[PDB]
Design a binder for these strands. Structure first.
Ligand SMILES: [Ca+2]
Length: 337
DNA sequence: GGGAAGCCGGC
DNA sequence: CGCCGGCTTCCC
């Protein structure tokens, strides 16, 4: 398999500089409100210590010279959509992982030769750069997971590569904390059990391991540690779809809300097109503007009716638990196929 | 079935 | 930047 993973560097900030070039070379911080937080920081801003998730208040007191802009999501979606469309032209299959990440299966495209894959990846960085002035990072590897890992090692504006010949040697010297699913709490204690690198997984009690990691993840690590891990690039998009409609007025009455919720399972569902969700979320935004959501997960796609049936059920649950008044109601679909 | 808990990771 | 939206597993 030949996977190219493409990661748009600090995408929201890059989009702002492309739109407003006078922002280039000065700190720029993109802000998100739900006090607000940093969604993205450009280079000069990051260089001063501004990080994603940081409260705007703390950011200002380390980058007072930064320009702080509000997040303009619809326009970032427009750029992303365009770049995704550049991508799928070069791919057999493309998995959109988020607004700024995509995995391309180009196996059948470079006629199976990893070398022409690397060059394809170059052409792809250059194309995006010429046409959209967006710099991206790419990783080229035999699978999705390796492609990502080496991509993150190559930040920013990079091109990282793990040749099929190098896979085993690479997997071997790989620290355990560099592995997705392995956060701080359990890296800490895989270390306490003598596991420092992914190879150490091979030489361990599978039961003393299992009891802290979990069955499915122990499996994951084993399969990974022996180059027997491979999940395919599914041709799809993981970006949640849905819309939230503003109501006539505040309401906590199930029957007043019900049709509003029912109509959102149209205004979005038409735009949903071919893809089929496994998860439903009713999103309620209070008069307070707080977000109250009840999601459920079903190992089955979602017909128009399977929504309604579980829709109001979840709307119930929301009303039956929160006391706040509700101003807008909506729906979010995820886990597509 | 589905809520509580712990963990990961994106923001 | 330390917090809370998805997944997995424990528990009732
Ligand atoms: Ca990233």
């Amino acid at each position: 398999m030949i996977v190219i993973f493409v990661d748009f560097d600090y995408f929201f900030a890059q989009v702002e500089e492309v739109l407003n070039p006078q922002y280039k070379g000065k700190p720029l911080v993109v802000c998100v409100y739900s006090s607000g937080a940093v969604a993205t920081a450009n280079y000069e801003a990051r260089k001063l210590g501004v990080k994603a998730g940081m409260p705007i208040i703390k950011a200002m007191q380390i980058a007072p010279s930064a320009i702080y802009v509000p997040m303009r999501k619809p326009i970032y979606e427009a750029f992303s959509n365009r770049i995704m469309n550049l991508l799928n032209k070069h791919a057999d299959k493309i998995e959109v992982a988020s607004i700024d990440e995509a995995y391309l299966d180009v196996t059948n495209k470079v006629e199976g030769n990893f070398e022409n894959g690397i060059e394809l990846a170059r052409k792809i960085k250059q194309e995006i750069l010429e046409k959209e002035k967006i710099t991206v990072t790419v990783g080229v590897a035999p699978n999705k997971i390796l492609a990502k890992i080496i991509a993150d090692k190559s930040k920013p504006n990079g091109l990282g590569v793990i040749r099929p010949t190098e896979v085993q040697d690479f997997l071997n010297e790989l620290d355990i904390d560099e592995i997705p699913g392995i956060g701080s709490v359990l890296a800490r204690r895989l270390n306490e059990l003598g596991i420092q690198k992914l190879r150490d997984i091979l030489s361990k009690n599978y039961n003393e391991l299992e009891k802290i990691t979990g069955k499915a993840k122990a499996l994951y690590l084993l399969k990974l540690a022996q180059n027997k891990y491979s999940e395919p690039v599914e041709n799809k998009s993981k970006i949640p779809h849905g819309r939230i409609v503003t109501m006539k007025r505040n309401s906590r009455n199930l029957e007043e809300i019900k049709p509003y919720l029912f109509r959102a399972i149209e205004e979005s569902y038409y735009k949903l097109d071919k893809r089929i969700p496994k998860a439903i979320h009713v999103v309620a935004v209070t008069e307070d503007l707080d977000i109250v959501s009840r999601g459920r997960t079903f190992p089955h796609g979602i017909s128009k009716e399977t929504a309604y049936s579980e829709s109001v059920k979840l709307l119930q649950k929301i009303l039956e638990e929160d006391e706040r008044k509700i101003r807008r109601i909506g729906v979010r679909f995820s886990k597509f196929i």
